[PDB]
Amino acid sequence: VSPKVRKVLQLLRLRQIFNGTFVKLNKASINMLRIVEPYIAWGYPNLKSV
Amino acid sequence: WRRWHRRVNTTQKRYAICSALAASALPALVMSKGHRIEEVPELPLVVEDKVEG
Amino acid sequence: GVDIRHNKDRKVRRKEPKSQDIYLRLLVKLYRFLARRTNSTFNQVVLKRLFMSRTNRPPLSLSRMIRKMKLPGRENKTAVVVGTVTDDVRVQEVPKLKVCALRVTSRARSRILKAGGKILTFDQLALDSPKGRGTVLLSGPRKGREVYRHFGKAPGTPHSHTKPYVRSKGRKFERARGRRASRGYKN
Amino acid sequence: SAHLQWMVVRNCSSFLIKRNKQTYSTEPNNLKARNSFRYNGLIHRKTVGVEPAADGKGVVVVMKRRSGQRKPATSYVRTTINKNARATLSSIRHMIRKNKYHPDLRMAAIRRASAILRSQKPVM
Amino acid sequence: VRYSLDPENPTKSCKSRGSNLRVHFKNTRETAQAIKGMHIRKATKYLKDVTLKKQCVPFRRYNGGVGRCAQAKQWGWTQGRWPKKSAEFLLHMLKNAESNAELKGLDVDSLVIEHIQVNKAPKMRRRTYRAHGRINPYMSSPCHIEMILTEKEQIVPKPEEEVAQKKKISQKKLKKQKLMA
RNA sequence: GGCUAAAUACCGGCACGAGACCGAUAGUCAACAAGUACCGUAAGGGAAAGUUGAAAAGAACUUUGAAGAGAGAGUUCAAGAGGGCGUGAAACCGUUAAGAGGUAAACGGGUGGGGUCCGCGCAGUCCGCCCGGAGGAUUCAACCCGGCGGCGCGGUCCGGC
RNA sequence: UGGAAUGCGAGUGCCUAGUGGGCCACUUUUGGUAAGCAGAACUGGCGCUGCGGGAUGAACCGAACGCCGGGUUAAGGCGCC
Ligand SMILES: [Mg+2]
Ligand SMILES: [Mg+2]
Ligand SMILES: [Mg+2]
Ligand SMILES: [Mg+2]
Ligand SMILES: [Mg+2]
Ligand SMILES: [Mg+2]
Ligand SMILES: [Mg+2]
Ligand SMILES: [Mg+2]
Ligand SMILES: [Mg+2]
Ligand SMILES: [Mg+2]
Ligand SMILES: [Mg+2]
Ligand SMILES: [Mg+2]
Ligand SMILES: [Mg+2]
Ligand SMILES: [Mg+2]
Ligand SMILES: [Mg+2]
Ligand SMILES: [Mg+2]
Ligand SMILES: [Mg+2]
Ligand SMILES: [Mg+2]
Ligand SMILES: [Mg+2]
Ligand SMILES: [Mg+2]
Ligand SMILES: [Mg+2]
Ligand SMILES: [Mg+2]
Ligand SMILES: [Mg+2]
Ligand SMILES: [Mg+2]
Ligand SMILES: [Mg+2]
């Protein structure tokens, strides 16, 4: 894992495969998700998912 | 010329003599050294000076 | 696999005295209970220092104890040092102190007692001050050792006032080149 | 003191057995033969010991008198109880609880007395 | 003295053995395997043929380089030889064993070679001189032999031409006996 | 120009004492007919090698063989200690017994089959209380006498250190 | 109103071994016709490291490893082996 992706994945707290977290979206966080784009699957969860 | 001999400070040597005598007045420590002192009347055991002769 | 480093998992710190002294460990048993079963942080600090090594338990001089116990508001408090209270001949008058220490030098006992003071042992402090109330915890100087003269930037670097390791001290012992501009250079 | 003396013998004693991942103490007045502070039969001012009678009838209860701690000859009081099984235990239970003489050894003494008495029955 | 095996019925068996015998161990191990289980009269008759080259000893284990012969076909084997010293040494041990049977009052005509074992004995040292001023071992390979004979229900009387032979007198044995007497 | 004891040194010599030393490939090269045997013209170089048994009681006598070797017998607690003999390992070999065998053998994991033996197995635990049937007593509680023991803020008993 | 988001306990001092032949891949890149060639930047790897796939293979793809049961997957596959 490249050094920048590795740091952003630890900040999201996704230090292990198939780990999940909620993230509240904004310019600061959407641009972080772009960096780890090859390493994550993300989307908008509905109430039942939560 | 291996170093066979050890210097021990005088104060620490006297400490050891003091701790050995203090531990010799306790039945538990004397018992735990394996001595059969279950019937000696007292500890420390003092006997009159006649025996020196 | 989890992405984490393991080089800092194990914290380096004493959990008990390296010393095998049985009286030290009886105090550690005593203050293990007090530190655990009371909300006092003084008990926790004392417990920690009973583990500390000899060089982490510097001796406290008599003069320094008097100086710190003379500050305003510290009247009738117990001076507590986890270490040895040495004597300071440079002092003239010793006031009436109440101290608790692991050791007190023979000549410092006579001076403290002759002035009306009291010398406790850490088992007596627990009965007197179970939570450490009314105390003044004191420490000896930790950098008061010849070794700390030799630590820091290497002596041969600019503005490095470190003490070198020389077998003998004199004009012929590491003073020519690198210590004066006349011989090569100085820094 | 007891705690000081335990710190000297906890691992250095002629009565200490360390074998097969087990630790035992063979001194008298140890109700479980256990290398323990509670059950050590030497370091406490008061101790309780249960032994079989010199003849295989009954048990001998040993209690440490209060006064002569430094006088081994007169330190221990021996009492021989040769009653029936339930009566023997009742005496031991009372000698401990009623006197408040090491109340924490009550069941250890009672379990030891039963084991000695049970041993003295004919072997089948 | 202990033998590797034990007789099943000791009252019906005779023993013989020899040690440090200067006959090749390899030739003799093969020779003994041939007569294992043989009736003594058959066994004695067989070893005399081996001396006369009328019957071969098949070399089954120690056969490296041993030649082929038509008499090894008797044994379901292609390789056979005629070790004369091995046969002669075993004929002496059998003769000793047969005398042991007589001393015990056993029917010698019913004996079978039940157990027979050839062991390596300590090796005797000589040397041979090689090119470039070198010396190499020249080792004899002696053997220990032990055989147990047992009685079975098959009887073979001894050959007529063998029982009629004269009890050979040895002059040198007479000399020593006279000197002792 | 000159003499002069003592306190100091001592891996040679004579005679001793001791050891947290080594224990027959160790310790001296040398535990033994070892500076020997043996090698080299010479100067020199230089080994291997301890152990039956308490006691030789060291196997008489018979028998096969020319003999070496055997079979019996005998001594001994034991020759299953037989004169380079205490014990007697491994490698290597003989034989016996069991198993198996055309991808050299060997090996890890998982079973299965067969043996060697082990459980010193084969109607399957022990303990407490209580119910009931049958019995038998150095027979229970409570009181009396005597001894010992624990504790007592004996709200403040006397005497002691 | 500890003055963006996110995550996370930090600071500090002594003593210190091995190492100081490296090599490989995407991208960038010098010399050379080129080289499984020589020389650089970045990151990641092998070296030090097994494991699933690439039949086989230091480095490729997936994924990193205490001893196990069940379930599901990755990269790869599903004629038979
Ligand atoms: Mg893990
Ligand atoms: Mg690690
Ligand atoms: Mg670390
Ligand atoms: Mg060939
Ligand atoms: Mg040829
Ligand atoms: Mg020549
Ligand atoms: Mg002179
Ligand atoms: Mg030797
Ligand atoms: Mg030697
Ligand atoms: Mg040897
Ligand atoms: Mg040895
Ligand atoms: Mg030698
Ligand atoms: Mg030997
Ligand atoms: Mg002997
Ligand atoms: Mg024997
Ligand atoms: Mg023997
Ligand atoms: Mg030997
Ligand atoms: Mg032997
Ligand atoms: Mg077979
Ligand atoms: Mg390159
Ligand atoms: Mg390397
Ligand atoms: Mg690494
Ligand atoms: Mg890897
Ligand atoms: Mg391929
Ligand atoms: Mg699984």
Largest sheet of chain B: none
Share of β-strand residues of chain B:
under 5%
Helix percentage of chain C: 25-40%
What string, H for helix and E for strand, traces the elements of chain B in order? HH
Query: Please, how many helices of chain C?
Result: 5
> N-to-C terminal Cα separation of chain C, in Å?
52 Å
Family (chain B): Belongs to the universal ribosomal protein uL4 family.
Function (chain B): Component of the large ribosomal subunit. The ribosome is a large ribonucleoprotein complex responsible for the synthesis of proteins in the cell.
Protein name (chain B): Large ribosomal subunit protein uL4
Subunit structure (chain B): Component of the large ribosomal subunit. May bind IPO9 with low affinity. Interacts with RBM3.
Question: How would you portray this structure in words?
Answer:
The structure is cut from a larger assembly and holds chains A (50 residues), B (53 residues), C (187 residues), D (124 residues) and E (181 residues). With 50 residues, chain A is mainly alpha-helical. Chain A has helices at 3-11, 27-35. The radius of gyration of chain A is 11 Å and the shape is globular. With 53 residues, chain B is an all-alpha fold. Chain B has helices at residues 10-23, 27-32. Chain B starts with 9 loop residues before the first helix and ends in a 21-residue tail after the last helix. In chain D, strand 1 and strand 2 (22-25) form a beta hairpin. Chain D starts with a helix and ends in a 5-residue tail after the last helix. The chains are: A mainly alpha (50), B mainly alpha (53), C alpha/beta (187), D alpha+beta (124), E alpha+beta (181). At the B-D interface, helix 2 of B face helix 1 and helix 2 of D. Chain E binds two RNA strands through strand 1, helix 1, helix 3, strand 4 and strand 7. Chain D: It is found in: Cytoplasm. Chain D: This is Large ribosomal subunit protein eL28.
